[PDB]
Amino acid sequence: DLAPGIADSLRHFKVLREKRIPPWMEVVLIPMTGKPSLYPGLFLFTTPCRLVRPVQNLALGKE
Amino acid sequence: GGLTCASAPQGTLRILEGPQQSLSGSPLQPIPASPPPQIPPGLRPRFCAFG
């Protein structure tokens, strides 16, 4: 009951450049469904040599 | 200085920073639609038929 509310406050730090969250971090919350979906977790990637692309986050208004 | 043992704790309060309120606005802010192309003003026949 906290992990959706942590994946939002780590995108609301990445799009606003706060608390040394890098702009290229992947906040990935693979949810718990109770079905054979992907393995659930909250996986934060910060390493180089990935691929990344810009969008507009509509709730804040920033890239 | 014996440091004897005690009973079992009933509950465990977890203190944590609150959710980020008033960060997202209640309406959404989309990128505006790129406009459809206009017929430009001041278009006239510049080619006259010869002779």
Side-chain angles (χ1 to χ4, degrees):
Chain A
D1 289 330
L2 268 61
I6 292 175
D8 290 332
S9 294
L10 270 75
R11 290 186 186 95
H12 288 66
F13 295 169
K14 179 180 70 172
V15 307
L16 292 172
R17 293 177 184 266
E18 292 181 355
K19 292 183 180 180
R20 275 83 57 82
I21 294 299
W24 55 83
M25 188 177 72
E26 291 181 0
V27 183
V28 181
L29 183 68
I30 311 171
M32 276 179 174
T33 51
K35 298 176 179 69
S37 58
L38 295 168
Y39 182 66
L42 191 154
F43 295 152
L44 302 170
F45 296 98
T46 56
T47 56
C49 299
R50 288 181 290 118
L51 285 80
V52 84
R53 80 180 185 97
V55 297
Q56 186 200 9
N57 193 357
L58 297 179
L60 280 307
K62 291 181 71 69
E63 176 266 330
Chain B
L3 278 73
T4 59
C5 183
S7 179
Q10 187 177 1
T12 57
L13 291 175
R14 177 69 181 165
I15 296 172
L16 51 87
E17 275 88 1
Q20 292 296 110
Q21 295 297 110
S22 179
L23 266 287
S24 298
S26 296
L28 283 81
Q29 194 270 330
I31 279 173
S34 180
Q38 282 76 234
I39 293 97
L43 293 181
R44 67 189 186 276
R46 292 178 174 88
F47 183 75
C48 62
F50 55 86

